[PDB]
Amino acid sequence: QQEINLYSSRHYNTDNELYAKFTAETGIKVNLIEGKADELLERIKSEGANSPADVLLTVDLARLWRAEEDGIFQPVQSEILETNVPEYLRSPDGMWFGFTKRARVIMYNKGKVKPEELSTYEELADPKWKGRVIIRSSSNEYNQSLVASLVVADGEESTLAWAKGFVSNFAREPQGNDTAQIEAVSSGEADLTLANTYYMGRLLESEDPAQKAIAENVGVFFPNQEGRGTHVNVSGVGVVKTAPNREGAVKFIEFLVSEPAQAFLAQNNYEYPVLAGVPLNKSVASFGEFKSDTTSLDKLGPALAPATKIMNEAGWK
């Protein structure tokens, strides 16, 4: 009918094609405003009631929770959203909804580690992994959310003990992003790390043989399968309280979690769809099926604070 103003901190070269499909089926133009997560959040708060923002699209529970607490979102009730998105992947009060799922798993050098040697996140604190593990900085959202999940499942005391052991096992000081960790593991600089599955998908699906060769030496292991499951996080979306086009905003979110959009995202961005039954990208499917921790993501929100305090006390740079 009219248009919506999308504030997104997620920039993918394929997003334009995705948004074009939404416009084709609804007749609603999408105005894209990009920027850093913290930048967009602050911009909305300052623009006030005159803010044109209809939808806020960001990544990781850490970002979504912060916006939810700041009262940036408005509750949304939709049969399609409640049916397509598992309850644990969306705000219990309908403030935000995940539309992609990413898993933070163990990636190991196939030449130095056997899957039989792996089991849970907690076991990585064991001295047998001393000097054999690497991971990015504790200031990264992915790691914060991961530690928050341990706080919730294991408690603060137990998580602090784990963190101290885990950090003492580091082969080197945290440096580089997830992809850097994967490269170092592939080369043999370290035996294992923790990274998001889609990064491996990008390498395996690369048109460059050299980049693909990097992934070929790294195995993917989903931890805690006999227990609570693998830690998962999401890319999420929510309708801004002051949205000038609430109706269009809701339609956009329903679009993102529908078959067409879900299949596109899984196939082109190598992430897991939230909608059950949607086919995965070939390479991602090759990792195998796994059990996801179904703990309500919103529950990890309040555990983010103690998680950061634990990482600092453990000496996780």
**SS3 sequence, 228-288?**
CCECEEEEEEEEECCCCCHHHHHHHHHHHCCHHHHHHHHHHHCCEECCCCCCCCHHHHCCC
Whole-angstrom distance, CA of residue 264 vs CA of residue 125:
38
Which experimental technique did the depositors report for determining this structure? X-ray
What domains, with CATH codes, occur in the chain?
1-102+234-280 (3.40.190.10), 103-233+281-317 (3.40.190.10)
| Among the listed residues 272, 237, 269, the one whose alpha carbon sits nearest the alpha carbon of residue 252 | 237
3-state helix, strand, coil in the chain (%, to 5): 45, 20, 35
Whole-angstrom distance, CA of residue 254 vs CA of residue 90:
13
Whole-angstrom distance, CA of residue 193 vs CA of residue 251:
39
β-pairing verdict for 3-8 and 232-239:
unpaired
Binding residues for Fe cation: 11-12, 142, 198-199
Three-state SS for 93?
A: coil
Residues 243 and 52 sit within 8 Å (Cβ to Cβ): no
Whole-angstrom distance, CA of residue 211 vs CA of residue 202:
9
Whole-angstrom distance, CA of residue 310 vs CA of residue 264:
38
Going by the DSSP 8-state scheme, the letter that residue 78 receives in this structure is -
Q: Resolution of this PDB entry, in A? A: 2.0
- What are the tokens at 79? 């049969």
Phi, psi of 12 (to 5 degrees): -125, 135
What residues have CB less than 8 Å from 271, skipping those under 6 apart?
100, 101, 102, 197, 198, 201, 235, 265, 284
| Among the listed residues 211, 216, 212, 175, the one whose alpha carbon sits nearest the alpha carbon of residue 193 | 175
Angle, alpha carbons 81-60-238 (nearest 5°) = 35
Residues 200 and 107 sit within 8 Å (Cβ to Cβ): yes
Binding residues: 11-12, 142, 198-199
Residue 309, H or E segment = helix 304-314
Residues 120 and 106 sit within 8 Å (Cβ to Cβ): no
Whole-angstrom distance, CA of residue 232 vs CA of residue 60:
10
Q: Is 111 exposed, middle or buried (0-12, 13-18, 19+ CB in 10 A)?
A: exposed
Three-state SS for 103?
A: strand
Residues 156 and 305 sit within 8 Å (Cβ to Cβ): no
